[model samples]
Target: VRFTGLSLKQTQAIEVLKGHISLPDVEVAVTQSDQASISIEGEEGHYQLTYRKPHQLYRALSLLVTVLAEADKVEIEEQAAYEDLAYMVDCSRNAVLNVASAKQMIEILALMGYSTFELYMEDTYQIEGQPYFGYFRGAYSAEELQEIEAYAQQFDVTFVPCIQTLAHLSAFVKWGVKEVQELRDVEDILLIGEEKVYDLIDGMFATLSKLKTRKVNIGMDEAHLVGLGRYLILNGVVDRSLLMCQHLERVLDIADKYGFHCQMWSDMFFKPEETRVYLDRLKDRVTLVYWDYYQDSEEKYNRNFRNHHKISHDLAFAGGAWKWIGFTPHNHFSRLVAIEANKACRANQIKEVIVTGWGDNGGETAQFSILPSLQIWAELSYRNDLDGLSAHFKTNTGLTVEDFMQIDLANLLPDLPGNLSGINPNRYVFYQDILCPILDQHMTPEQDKPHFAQAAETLANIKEKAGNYAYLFETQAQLNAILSSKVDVGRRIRQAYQADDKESLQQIARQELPELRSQIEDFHALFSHQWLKENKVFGLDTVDIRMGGLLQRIKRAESRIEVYLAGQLDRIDELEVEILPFTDFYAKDFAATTANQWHTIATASTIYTT
Candidate 1:
């Protein structure tokens, strides 16, 4: 192979190609081209892949390998649909990725042709002179951020800092520090017209100024009661649209002092009756990000885009990977929404698209599970070749598409009758109290028995083929088996006690309850192992506390039932009254269930109402 029009820096592309495929005595010629292309000739298969940039060369080489191994044809030409393709990683929701995990993600993103990465840190980074700002919350040090920035740059991935400037500052507001308390309004929303708020943001940008991307995401979304809180107490009630704009203008000035090209969530501006009025207020002041996660229709995105187009021409679309909701990722839903959003981007000529991995509640969902959706966005942004994605994923990640897709089974139970639209039985099974059986109305014992039983069997089959993630699937299968054994035992205990069947109640207390207790212990061991492997140890205490409390409660309930059966007690009040039919809490959806603060088995009695 011979080389042409290549720099010393461009030789890194050859190293990447050699890592994926072995080229035996094949001379590779590199040349600058308007678009990436590969041409192969002769029986010996000499090939030339031309690309304009180093990352483009990697993409062309990847396509060339895919064609050589899977396709009959030899020649390929591909062009990227968007000039800038980025990914936003949510690191604040109790699941900060250590440096090792972040590197693994950057390597995968480089393989999939993503050029930029954003760490969405609400209050997960240290600020100068503020000890209690992110104290004990696992915020990244300035040195750690610089290390990540340098590491990502090795793979040609740009690292951008994303922080909250207005709302979503719960981490700071909850600290109860005098400085933070003075600026905070209700529920994490910052008080507008406060100079202290801008001072805090100034410190954040100064701390992050080392990572030289110059692009920033100032999160100003979901400040529902923006001016209705302390801001109204200090200053009289004012139009929130005007207030938000005024606050953003000041924030943008701070970003400008740091030489940042600032961007923000576009929802707050849309609250005004006239969209154009808000757009005119903040036009060219900051770039707007139109983020939507649930909509699956292109028309909905198109309508939203049409509205945004009237406001500003500089915009980006942010769709979700649905990893924030619960213990499992909704990759299927994420792919559907991403596909529609990508189509809308192409239709509207939007130049950039960022797929967001938000850990909304506790960040229990592993970030690795969302790889399928991220791959979908990367592939769709480059070309419309869904058929080749499975091969591409396997080649790049050394994991099968089937193995990646099995992560969805963590959310889905095995075959059951009825529509599975808003159903998330896995979370229900995990959070359901052993004594209370809160979600029993939505899923009966007869229904869940076979569902979890079959889910265990199916996951066992998939576990055999899951390469690096075999333990993850194994953990899911173990949880399913545990649920299968424990699903009906609670209701049966209640029924037997209410019917005065002491023998049946004694059998349950002796056999079923002990077996369920053993399974819970085993599941907890395995789950703890899996969580610590992927995430930091900051949030595992919550899991331990919840599961430990569950174990004790089950023991207490078992003792009570035993005492009643022995005639030592007249009745068990918890079992004396029949459980009434209750509507499904949070509609049995993943997002709705885990949207707010964490709840334990004991405190979640609202879900177990009789």
Candidate 2:
């Protein structure tokens, strides 16, 4: 490959490549398109780039890394090669990425030796959702996607557009699924699968497919409460499991019709025992994308996945790249965990590892919260030499394990101690103090509630005391948005109880639950960061006591709310169940079970508030 007109001030890029490459003769021609632009053309490849790109430094370095790794056939000492490392950035969340940021991400991944990009597009990009994002825009256009596709080909990377299908269709669902409803379960659908789901899916595929990158990840994951029961009743059906399978089959059939293979989460498929049968039949047709990131240990939890893989060698297991949870602050753990999981995965015949970044349960914040971590992960996944690559990350990227941990403090500021004074200010403290304790505690329900309440109260008080030097201030304006969301949730909870007045209760629950959950989950997201930072800072065994204490309480509260809300939902369900008995009425009785559920949510809230 010839070195295009690109110039580099860093000789480390050259040295790393030289050390890794053993080609008998390789020539790289370099030129400057301008002072800012660099181009390289040689026997190995050809490319032109500029420092102004989002991840210019990382990209340039990655290109050098890729060349060397490929040339030297760098051995993956940890046991797995991220043959295809893919990441999905959801613009639908408020933390929208600018064109520069997006390009920077692409470039960084390219440098890290990753070959796939999943742009998780939702309504925000096309101007359907939040009005505030009206000012926000994407730098790349349809034509640019093609250019990127062409450019990526030179580096051996494939860009695939990921869009929600089957649910998460808030935009299209509002538009109406009347036409598509004729084909499958369309009514009462969520954001990912609805009439709008097919609309955007088709639009994205049409526009993105133009890039000539054939791979498409039809995101049919995480809409666990998809209104299947209602849809089945509306159509005079009985089994929701069968209905779900039918809906999935419809998506698979559509993808097949378009000449695109498909990938979806394995959660919904494991719903009922009968659903497993559907997977057995559809296993050959669709890619079984199993996601288990929330688990404590990928290796341990993955042992349970053996039977599924034994079912089919084609199963593509994308080990979750967890966002920083102290041990792997700022997603620094992404590559490390991916490397480790890959070791265990290869033994189980797992194929394709996609490191995922969630905009820290605060949705948008979580999404943008871990870019640095993602960068590290990208390198780990793409480069075969872990030790060498990690060294490069430390020296060249201005990243340290300590910095990663400090960032965790920032990430968890909303729910943790305000002062980092004793936390050693070293990022690795997060791993030692915060994350390790929480992981180690494994507290039971009997011992968890009080502990969590105390921790939540302590963190809240710390934030109150700090006044300004807290995580919430890091994203100041967003603090109001977060607060407003919390108020709205309280209102929704009260209104759901009055649901008997009209469908107002159902409407309130539907509208409020999701928005509220987003906020609550955001609160929940802060715990891991705080726990890790606290433990690392304090160096105590009780770190987990506080961390797990808060987490367990929040989860318990959430589950209780679901059950309580189920009682009110049950009231509505009774009306629906009477109208159509096919759907399960268990969730309908949540309101009747309100007293117990309310205690949990109230207790959980008090813990955090105190």
Candidate 3:
């Protein structure tokens, strides 16, 4: 490739692009334009990339290369209507992204035409002089942030600081220090109208003071009982909205000190009509980010988009890439919602948009699984259409969207067919106790078991094709391989025991349990590989402990079965109890899936044995 009117390094990135797909030798000339457009022209095996800005150059190059594989001369132009098309990755929960993977994604997302990126850290980033802030949670240091910012500048992507000032501070205060303890008014919320709270907030802003960008998403969402806790004991029941704005005023004052313009999640203050009046007062102070990732249609998000504009025209909407669901990603589900949601946002003229990738429970889903949804969201932003998305994705990423959708089969129960409602029970089924599994109550031995065998087949086939991202699909495929045999083991054991089929129980003890244990360990190794590839290894131990504990449980259950079958025991006590529905809520709901948390899936007994 030959280039002109460019200064950014392209040698190694060119090698990386060639590694993905076959491309012809071509002459490439580039120039910058004021209009937000990326145009491709020139014939005779030559290309001219006219970019709107320095950041648009990578995306333009991506377009030129993606087209060169198919044609001798390319004539295409792409324009971004929105000022900011961004994505946020949640690092606060457990998995903090590794810097190397973070840089790779910055360039990949830039290649997809994203203008900004955010790492939402509740306390997963260092605060200057505050050692206990992120503590042992793998927080990013200031130098790491600076390094990321420099790389982000290379792609013209804004690296925004997303931290919590009012709520979502449980990790920050979980260790119970004097500073953090005093900062919390209730669980995960900061004490309002307090000077000490401002001090910590000031420190958080100071931590990011050297970044190139001025934007900060100081999350103040989900503080529902804000002043109703410790604040009420100190200062009597105050008007909550009034108190919230007062806290915001104080937080913004500190943000100003660092020259940071702030945006916040708008869930806390959205109320009835009278309270909508309150938002009008602070319209100029901050951007109110309206976040939703649940709905599947544009009409569903229409009212929320309309209402946010009423609150403030300086609005942004956050959609989800569906990484928060345990162990599996709902990329198809996320795109189902995003297409309509992005349509609604564009129809409503809501300019700024960002899709979020959250790690809710131990960050089990590979953060890399969000790639397809990010591609879909970015394409929707720049083209306002999805005409050539699949081919475009193939060209840009060197992977097919067809394979990415296969990853969603981990949660897809063919028996439980519903739109955007295939709750992720595979994770629960994979971990639920062998002796007293709760999902055994709803176990469709025929339907659920067949799905896993199929899921396992489909995922492994794609794992071969998903080069560079093979481990992600392998991890999910191995999980399905485990579930294919293990999903109905609990039910099978109980039925055989209740009927006095001792021979069947003996077979399970000696043969099935041992083979299943091997699958679990294999799945664990693959899952650990996927986790460590994209994230810091801090959260790997938590998942390791859960899977390890499940392994021990399997051994104990196997031993119990062996003793009972050998007539060394009077009865298997765990098989004696008549299992009822898992819970009242689960019994009433026809499509009930097991709880997504580790504690609930582990046992019915209270985790706290007080």
Candidate 4:
């Protein structure tokens, strides 16, 4: 066993060793220098103990003893908490939650032994910025913000106030700058280097600094329109990507001055390798929060983690909670995936892990919800064993891995007979047998050569049948989700195939996609109306770009389908065989075109009634 500054309670430590010791042999010892240390040596290997604070060490020991006893009973490697983990919630997206809900969540999280609470403050949280564009949500007052922070601290959870620096400021866009009307060029309006933007950021730092938290999650991820044509078209400036990097530098510099350790999201930078070079320049100045939720396979996940580890060991990649918002109570597979990902990082010696909780989008609230998954994350962070923790989750969340995909009403709403409240345990009986395997099947990547034109034609036919009907909105969205899921799987499968790992592709087909498909289907069935409204959520231009492109493709496909339908073409079987594969490529292309359309939509704002 490895030694440390912390010590475990003798009785608890002995109890833990009793389970771990296979033979009639077991041992435990201690050391001095204010480093309370506990080392357990038995049949398998050595386990070390290290904690900065005594209370932390004590908590770890208590959990260790509990897990060891449990493991001893089962004659397996038992897992338990070594350190209490933390999770932060972002209430700024919507003002629907009050202090009571926040505190209730904290109490639940803390009871599961989470030690940190991050309240991601967007425009709505104590910042005098404008509300998010196209989103109906209110911001919390500065005084209310302080009250929540204090309440979180009272529960022994560190309150880290999170804010967006450059992008994801949908709120800031809605609140315009009076001084720079010319800069307000986009229809989906966002603050662009305006006085109000700087003022808002500055005010947030001032108020948040008064709280006891030391870290700030300055969200700088997923700025899809960092730089490009329109901003270049409006102003004679070239390269908005360069401008976006500059924006990050400016904001991060200010955050540094405030004595806050800044953490920013790493998606935008990682997507374009050139941005990585930009980050290398500022690597020492700021902390990069590499988020890798999209990476599924063990090798890819490990590679991403190791790459980030190599880039900066000091950096923390915010990990994902097993579940989305209001969905299944727990997800053993997802948590297992997280555990394995964390293990890869641990093996690589990366120190920090930030388990994230995302809401809305695919992350809408579930039946048992994100809370159970949060608990599972805590267990994993503390224990580091998947099997043991999966069993624990099965007990606490009352969910099986199959239940998570097939029948958990917590994950699906709106489509499940009634509103969110209608989902319950009964839904699972019908769900478990039918949907589980289907859910598992969709994560499989298609290894065959995809006939893009043919696939596109088939998708167009499906869209003709599926798109225009308002009732089919959810199905269409599910189709989109499957296509999106396939695109993701396809990328991974191709990567594996390119690397000549045939076995990997086969495993993905057998293991991953089906379950993912099931979840997508359930999500579609549940959230149909929400999917329809999403078209209108942004501006019409954005909608045109997203759906219009699909419409255009469908129109083209319609011509192809007409020939096939008329029995004039023999290629119908070949073209329409894997229509699911085409949806992803179509959507991605649509997204690119949508961005351009958003620019036009932004400019046509003069026609808007508001």
Ranking by lDDT: 3, 1, 4, 2
- Predicted structure with the largest TM-score when compared to the true one: 3
Better candidate by TM-score, 2 or 4: 4
Q: What clash count goes with each model?
A: 2, 58, 0, 41
- Per-residue CA lDDT of model 3 for 85-114, tens digit only, reads 888888877889999888878877877888
Instruction: In angstroms, give how far residue 474 of model 3 lies from its true place.
Output: 1.5
lDDT of 1: 0.73
Q: In model 4, which runs have C-alpha deviations exceeding 4 angstroms?
A: 1-84, 92-96, 128-136, 175-196, 271-278, 322-333, 366-368, 387-610
lDDT of 1 at 366: 72
* Tens-digit lDDT track of model 1 for 1-610: 4555566665665564455443444455667666443233323455666765456655555565566675444656667788778888888887778777787777778778888888888888999888877767778899888988877777667888889988887877987658769888788888888888788889988997877678888888756799988888888878777787788778888888989888888876564455446547676877889988867678989999999887787898888887775666777777777778888899999888888998866776777778888888888887755667887777666666666776666455444322223345566566666567654555556656776788778888877876666667777788788778676676787788778888898888888778788988988887777777776677667678777877887787788887887789987877655554334344432221222233632344453234
Error of 3 at 451 (Å): 2.2
Candidate 3 residue spans exceeding 4 A from truth: 8-23, 34-36, 272-279, 578-594, 608-610
The local distance difference test score of each candidate is 0.73, 0.43, 0.80, 0.45
**Tens digits of lDDT, candidate 4, 110-169:** 444566677665555544343332244435666776777776655445676777766565
Model 3's alpha-carbon lDDT is 0.80
Give the alpha carbon lDDT tens digit for every residue of 1-610 in model 2: 3343433533334433333233234344333233332222233433333332322333444444444544543221122244456776655433344443455455446554455766665444343322321223332356755665655544445777666666654433444235433423444253223455455446545555566766777776645455544454455544555656766777776676577877766655554567678867876776767765533345664675775666665656665444423212334334445555655655665557666654321232333335445555554443433445444443333333333333343223232222211111111111211111211111122332333333344444444433212442223222323333332233333344445443555444455445544653454355334323211112222333443453454344344455555664353221221111211222231111111111222232343233
Give the best candidate by lDDT: 3
Candidate 2: misplaced stretches above 4 Å? 1-80, 124-151, 171-204, 222-230, 271-278, 296-298, 321-329, 332-336, 360-372, 375-386, 394-396, 400-405, 411-610
